[PDB]
Design an enzyme around this catalytic site. Structure first.
Site, PDB file in Angstrom:
ATOM      1  N   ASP A 124      13.528   2.792 -16.112  1.00 27.78           N
ATOM      2  CA  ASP A 124      13.829   2.782 -17.487  1.00 27.78           C
ATOM      3  C   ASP A 124      12.885   3.710 -18.097  1.00 27.78           C
ATOM      4  O   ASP A 124      11.685   2.998 -17.935  1.00 27.78           O
ATOM      5  CB  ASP A 124      14.269   1.476 -17.984  1.00 27.78           C
ATOM      6  CG  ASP A 124      13.441   0.159 -17.989  1.00 27.78           C
ATOM      7  OD1 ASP A 124      13.804  -0.809 -18.227  1.00 27.78           O
ATOM      8  OD2 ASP A 124      12.050   0.584 -18.114  1.00 27.78           O
ATOM      9  N   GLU A 134      12.834  -0.219 -10.498  1.00 26.69           N
ATOM     10  CA  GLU A 134      13.349  -0.738 -11.802  1.00 26.69           C
ATOM     11  C   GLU A 134      13.356   0.381 -13.177  1.00 26.69           C
ATOM     12  O   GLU A 134      12.525   0.130 -14.139  1.00 26.69           O
ATOM     13  CB  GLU A 134      12.331  -1.959 -12.366  1.00 26.69           C
ATOM     14  CG  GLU A 134      12.551  -2.924 -11.014  1.00 26.69           C
ATOM     15  CD  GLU A 134      11.742  -4.443 -11.633  1.00 26.69           C
ATOM     16  OE1 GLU A 134      11.864  -4.586 -12.872  1.00 26.69           O
ATOM     17  OE2 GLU A 134      11.440  -5.200 -10.959  1.00 26.69           O
ATOM     18  N   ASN A 191       5.944  -5.072  -4.827  1.00 22.39           N
ATOM     19  CA  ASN A 191       6.268  -4.384  -6.225  1.00 22.39           C
ATOM     20  C   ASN A 191       5.406  -4.471  -7.266  1.00 22.39           C
ATOM     21  O   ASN A 191       4.862  -5.694  -7.298  1.00 22.39           O
ATOM     22  CB  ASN A 191       8.012  -4.837  -6.439  1.00 22.39           C
ATOM     23  CG  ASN A 191       8.579  -4.139  -7.440  1.00 22.39           C
ATOM     24  OD1 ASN A 191       8.766  -2.777  -7.259  1.00 22.39           O
ATOM     25  ND2 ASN A 191       9.160  -4.655  -8.357  1.00 22.39           N
ATOM     26  N   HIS A 244       8.969   1.277 -15.134  1.00 23.26           N
ATOM     27  CA  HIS A 244       9.146   0.655 -16.414  1.00 23.26           C
ATOM     28  C   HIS A 244       8.225   1.735 -17.324  1.00 23.26           C
ATOM     29  O   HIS A 244       7.093   1.330 -17.595  1.00 23.26           O
ATOM     30  CB  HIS A 244       9.080  -0.470 -16.843  1.00 23.26           C
ATOM     31  CG  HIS A 244      10.147  -1.520 -15.916  1.00 23.26           C
ATOM     32  ND1 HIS A 244      11.391  -1.423 -16.589  1.00 23.26           N
ATOM     33  CD2 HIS A 244       9.923  -2.669 -15.017  1.00 23.26           C
ATOM     34  CE1 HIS A 244      11.923  -2.169 -15.817  1.00 23.26           C
ATOM     35  NE2 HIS A 244      11.089  -3.192 -15.063  1.00 23.26           N
ATOM     36  N   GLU A 287       4.251  -7.858  -8.645  1.00 23.61           N
ATOM     37  CA  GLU A 287       3.131  -7.862  -9.930  1.00 23.61           C
ATOM     38  C   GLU A 287       1.955  -8.873  -9.335  1.00 23.61           C
ATOM     39  O   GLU A 287       1.566  -9.624 -10.287  1.00 23.61           O
ATOM     40  CB  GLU A 287       3.817  -8.318 -11.266  1.00 23.61           C
ATOM     41  CG  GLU A 287       5.154  -7.509 -11.603  1.00 23.61           C
ATOM     42  CD  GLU A 287       5.602  -7.949 -12.913  1.00 23.61           C
ATOM     43  OE1 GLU A 287       5.084  -9.170 -13.376  1.00 23.61           O
ATOM     44  OE2 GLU A 287       6.336  -7.361 -13.532  1.00 23.61           O
TER      45      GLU A 287
HETATM   46  O1  LIG Z   1      16.480  -9.980 -17.949  1.00 22.13           O
HETATM   47  C1  LIG Z   1      15.292  -9.718 -17.656  1.00 22.13           C
HETATM   48  C2  LIG Z   1      14.938  -8.961 -16.809  1.00 22.13           C
HETATM   49  O2  LIG Z   1      15.319  -7.513 -16.839  1.00 22.13           O
HETATM   50  C3  LIG Z   1      13.521  -8.726 -16.342  1.00 22.13           C
HETATM   51  O3  LIG Z   1      13.549  -8.028 -15.169  1.00 22.13           O
HETATM   52  C4  LIG Z   1      12.126  -7.915 -14.979  1.00 22.13           C
HETATM   53  C5  LIG Z   1      11.376  -6.592 -15.433  1.00 22.13           C
HETATM   54  N1  LIG Z   1      10.027  -6.466 -15.225  1.00 22.13           N
HETATM   55  C6  LIG Z   1       9.695  -6.445 -13.786  1.00 22.13           C
HETATM   56  C7  LIG Z   1      10.236  -7.415 -13.066  1.00 22.13           C
HETATM   57  O4  LIG Z   1      10.110  -7.443 -11.476  1.00 22.13           O
HETATM   58  C8  LIG Z   1      11.647  -8.112 -13.167  1.00 22.13           C
HETATM   59  O5  LIG Z   1      12.259  -9.143 -12.528  1.00 22.13           O
HETATM   60  O6  LIG Z   1      12.927 -10.067 -16.207  1.00 22.13           O
HETATM   61  C9  LIG Z   1      13.091 -10.907 -17.422  1.00 22.13           C
HETATM   62  C10 LIG Z   1      14.483 -11.207 -17.743  1.00 22.13           C
HETATM   63  O7  LIG Z   1      14.696 -11.920 -18.918  1.00 22.13           O
END
Ligand SMILES: O[C@@H]1[C@@H](O)[C@H](O[C@@H]2CNC[C@H](O)[C@H]2O)OC[C@H]1O
Length: 312
Positions: A235, A233, A169, A205, A127
């Site tokens: 979802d 990731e 990423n 996401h 990010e």
């Molecule tokens: O448990 C969560 C976890 O799922 C979350 O994961 C991030 C989602 N967004 C993108 C990132 O690269 C991931 O690391 O991070 C927060 C945790 O509390």
């Protein structure tokens, strides 16, 4: 095929999931993890807060658990993530200039070296960009080190692990837009100057009914820069509670995402951010939204399952 693992194996691609090592002791969770995937990533165990809670004091128990699970079950291991502005301990945020840069470099070196030969790919930097284009405006790395921290992290990672696939990423970069364009320029630049960089991870996401129509075209243009691409990731969140129509749209979306990957030779595969809605990170982060994964809270396959199977 009878499992998504077999489907993906047959397509010569990866289908992974984000693991919480503590859940391996939950029978149904382990059963699905063992039989439906061929790749695993640590949802949280390899992040900075979990690996270096205090400066120069590393804690690899949890990350090791995830790594061992992958080796023990014959699954590929994806590393997440060495440099990220979130889940960054205060001790690191309290450092500046050379002191901060040295801590970042050491964190990268120590973690990459620890998992060397086990982790096959790393989200080295996560990010780095902002929606609308440009660099992220609330990153400790961007604010303390400026634009050059990304290249430093990648060079440091390569030095520590000469063979691991090094990726950058981000989210909201699945389609062609201002944000993905900034990332595109970065990738092109790095390849041009010989900066270590082998892949781009598209978090993916997404929101139900909002899969970018140019997802595959975007994936292909990055791949054409000389790097691999991967959905890291996935979802697809909806407004809760779920219903037949919402689950149907979701299934169609999952099919479109997997298809886009299938349509690009260099797309290594798709990794979903978890197994069950029961533990999905969405509800707590996006109030009023959820039911984003392939299995519901009762570990029952949702319509998305068949869609992914068909897509592979
Ligand atoms: O448990 C969560 C976890 O799922 C979350 O994961 C991030 C989602 N967004 C993108 C990132 O690269 C991931 O690391 O991070 C927060 C945790 O509390």
């Amino acid at each position: 095929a009878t499992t998504l693992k077999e489907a993906a194996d047959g397509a010569g691609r990866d289908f992974g999931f984000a693991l919480d090592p503590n859940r391996l002791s939950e029978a149904q969770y382990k059963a699905i993890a063992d039989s439906e995937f061929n790749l695993v990533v640590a949802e949280n165990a390899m992040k900075w807060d979990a690996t270096e809670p205090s400066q120069n004091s590393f804690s690899f128990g949890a990350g090791d658990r995830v790594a061992s699970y992958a080796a023990d079950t014959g699954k590929e291991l994806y590393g997440h993530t060495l440099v990220w502005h979130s889940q960054l301990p205060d001790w690191a945020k309290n450092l500046n200039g050379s002191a901060f840069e040295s801590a970042m470099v050491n964190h990268v070196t120590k973690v990459a070296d620890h998992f060397e030969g086990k982790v096959a790919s790393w989200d080295v930097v996560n990010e780095a960009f902002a929606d609308g284009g440009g660099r992220r405006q609330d990153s400790a790395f961007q604010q303390k080190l400026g634009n050059g921290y990304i290249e430093t992290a990648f060079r440091a990672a390569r030095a520590a692990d000469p063979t691991a696939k090094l990726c950058i990423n981000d989210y909201n970069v699945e389609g062609i837009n201002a944000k993905s364009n900034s990332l595109y320029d970065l990738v092109k630049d790095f390849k041009a100057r010989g900066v270590p960089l082998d892949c781009v991870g598209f978090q993916s996401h997404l929101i139900v009914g909002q899969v970018p129509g140019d997802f595959r075209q975007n994936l292909q243009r990055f791949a054409d820069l000389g790097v691999d691409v991967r959905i890291t990731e996935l979802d697809i969140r909806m407004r809760t509670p779920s219903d037949a129509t919402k689950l149907a749209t979701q299934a169609a979306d999952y099919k479109k995402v997997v298809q886009a990957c299938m349509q690009v030779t260099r797309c290594q595969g798709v990794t979903v951010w978890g197994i069950t809605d029961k533990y999905s990170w969405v509800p707590d982060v996006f109030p009023g939204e959820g039911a984003a994964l392939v299995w519901d809270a009762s570990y029952a396959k949702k319509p998305a399952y068949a869609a992914v199977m068909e897509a592979f």
